[PDB]
Structures are given as structure tokens and as C-alpha cells.
Design an enzyme around this catalytic site. Structure first.
Site, short mmCIF file in Angstrom:
data_model
loop_
_atom_site.label_atom_id
_atom_site.label_comp_id
_atom_site.label_asym_id
_atom_site.label_seq_id
_atom_site.Cartn_x
_atom_site.Cartn_y
_atom_site.Cartn_z
N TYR A 18 0.98 -1.18 0.54
CA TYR A 18 -0.16 -0.17 -0.12
C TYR A 18 0.70 1.17 0.37
O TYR A 18 0.62 1.80 -0.75
CB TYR A 18 -1.08 -0.07 0.80
CG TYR A 18 -1.38 2.19 1.64
CD1 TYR A 18 -2.86 1.51 0.57
CD2 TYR A 18 -1.11 1.94 2.43
CE1 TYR A 18 -3.57 2.77 1.00
CE2 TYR A 18 -2.17 3.05 2.66
CZ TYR A 18 -3.40 3.38 1.84
OH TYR A 18 -3.92 4.90 1.53
N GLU A 40 -11.15 6.24 3.68
CA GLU A 40 -11.07 7.00 4.36
C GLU A 40 -11.63 7.28 5.67
O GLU A 40 -11.83 7.86 6.88
CB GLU A 40 -10.17 8.35 4.33
CG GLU A 40 -8.81 7.91 3.27
CD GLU A 40 -7.68 8.17 3.82
OE1 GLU A 40 -7.89 8.09 5.20
OE2 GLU A 40 -6.63 6.95 3.77
N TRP A 48 -6.03 2.20 10.87
CA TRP A 48 -5.89 3.19 9.46
C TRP A 48 -5.69 1.09 9.13
O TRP A 48 -6.71 0.55 8.19
CB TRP A 48 -4.72 3.15 8.77
CG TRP A 48 -5.06 3.19 7.41
CD1 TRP A 48 -4.22 2.84 6.40
CD2 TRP A 48 -6.00 3.65 6.54
NE1 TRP A 48 -4.67 2.72 5.48
CE2 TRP A 48 -5.76 3.71 4.85
CE3 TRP A 48 -7.45 4.08 6.86
CZ2 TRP A 48 -6.56 3.52 4.07
CZ3 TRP A 48 -8.46 4.45 5.81
CH2 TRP A 48 -7.94 3.81 4.67
C1 ADK Z 1 -1.50 6.13 9.35
N1 ADK Z 1 -2.50 6.22 8.13
C2 ADK Z 1 -1.98 5.91 6.76
N2 ADK Z 1 -2.55 5.74 5.56
C3 ADK Z 1 -3.64 6.24 5.46
N3 ADK Z 1 -4.11 6.31 4.27
C4 ADK Z 1 -4.53 6.78 6.26
N4 ADK Z 1 -5.69 7.24 6.88
C5 ADK Z 1 -5.69 7.47 8.42
N5 ADK Z 1 -4.35 7.32 8.70
C6 ADK Z 1 -3.89 7.33 7.80
#
Ligand code: ADK
Ligand code: ZN
Length: 188
Positions: A18, A40, A48
Site C-alpha cells: 500500500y 478514509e 488505518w
Molecule cells: C496512518 N494512515 C496511513 N494511511 C492512510 N491512508 C491513513 N488514513 C488514516 N490514517 C492513515
């Protein structure tokens, strides 16, 4: 090293893949942007990585985030989803995705393209946040706050300023990778 600092200290290949292939990598496809945004919106109160690992369940539950189909989901569909395995069983969170899909459709009617609508917020090109250390990172800013307020008028829910800032980083409208991260995208 730098990747560890950039990628929230993870050694999990799911999260690392990712980080390398999605997070902060400019995304221009409208339906794909909707998907990241909707995911999100499911985060609050959870980690997450927890949401990331539920991605396939969400894709099954929500017709691969195709907005025309999602926007037509009924209260009865949500009743069913409350016991669908491995999505977040939070009724307002699930209802929010349906409302988001309706808003996406309204945006596309007015502006042609959800992607063009969104990319306008960064003048059509990724904003490099120029971070060097993970400690440099902020969690919200003026542009994310504006986009959050603007999405509400179209019926989007569960997308406050902090959440929208996270989406901008994830979609690569913002590049929040550290300068030395091996996954930092090249810019022009
Ligand atoms: C820590 N983190 C990393 N990637 C994302 N897309 C996130 N959305 C909320 N928190 C996230
Ligand atoms: Zn990185």
C-alpha cells in the site's frame, strides 16, 4: 531507515505494498478516488491498517465502490450490511458511503469529473509537502478544511477536515513521503 520512518513503522507486506503502490502516488481516476475517499471515512475509532485489511469486504459490500450502484442502496441494503462479515458494523459509517456516492453524482453533474473537481484543490498537480522527518507531519490544513466544508454541501458525510487531509495524502494530491523514502514519487 527512511522507509520505516515514512511508513508508520510497519513491517507488514500488506501495508508496505500500500505504501509503495498507492499511498501518495498521484491518482487521477474518478471512481478510484471515490473508493479511497469512502475508505478514509470508515477510519475514525479504528487503526488505518484495520480498514486496509477490510478493503475486499467493502468492495464486495459496496459493488466495488461504483457510485451509480452505491448511491441507489436502500435502508434494507444497509440492514443487510449490518451483519455482513468483516466490514465495520457502524450504521452511520455505512450510511455515509451511500450519501457520499450521491454527492459524487451531484459533483459530476455540475463539474463533469469528480477527479477534475478534486485536482482543482491543488491546481492540477501534486503538492509536495517536502517532509524530511515523520515528526514534520501535520494532520490538517486549510485546503483540506475547505474541501471538507465543500463536500458537505453535496451530501458527503463522515469526512471532516482531518479525514480529508488523510485522503489527500493517500490519493497523492499531497505527497507526504519523507525526502529519503524509497517510495517517494518523482515530481515535475
Ligand atoms: C496512518 N494512515 C496511513 N494511511 C492512510 N491512508 C491513513 N488514513 C488514516 N490514517 C492513515
Ligand atoms: Zn514513504
Amino acid at each position: 531507515g527512511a522507509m520505516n520512518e515514512c511508513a508508520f513503522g510497519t513491517k507488514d507486506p500488506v501495508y508496505l505494498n500500500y505504501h509503495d503502490h498507492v499511498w501518495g502516488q498521484p491518482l487521477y481516476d474518478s471512481k478510484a478516488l471515490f473508493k479511497l475517499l469512502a475508505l478514509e471515512s470508515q477510519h475514525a475509532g479504528l487503526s488505518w491498517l484495520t480498514i486496509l485489511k477490510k478493503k475486499e469486504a467493502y468492495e464486495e459490500a459496496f459493488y466495488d465502490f461504483e457510485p451509480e450502484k452505491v448511491a441507489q442502496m436502500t435502508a434494507q441494503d444497509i440492514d443487510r450490511l449490518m451483519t455482513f462479515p468483516n466490514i465495520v458494523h457502524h450504521r452511520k459509517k455505512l450510511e455515509a458511503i451511500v450519501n457520499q456516492a450521491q454527492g459524487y453524482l451531484k459533483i459530476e453533474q455540475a463539474y463533469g469529473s469528480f477527479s477534475k473537481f478534486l485536482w482543482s484543490y491543488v491546481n492540477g498537480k501534486p503538492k509536495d509537502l517536502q517532509y524530511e522527518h515523520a515528526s514534520d507531519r501535520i494532520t490538517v490544513d486549510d485546503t483540506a478544511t475547505q474541501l471538507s466544508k465543500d463536500l458537505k454541501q453535496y451530501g458527503f458525510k463522515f469526512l471532516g477536515p482531518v479525514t480529508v487531509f488523510s485522503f489527500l495524502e493517500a490519493a497523492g494530491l499531497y505527497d507526504a513521503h519523507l525526502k529519503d523514502c524509497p517510495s517517494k514519487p518523482k515530481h515535475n
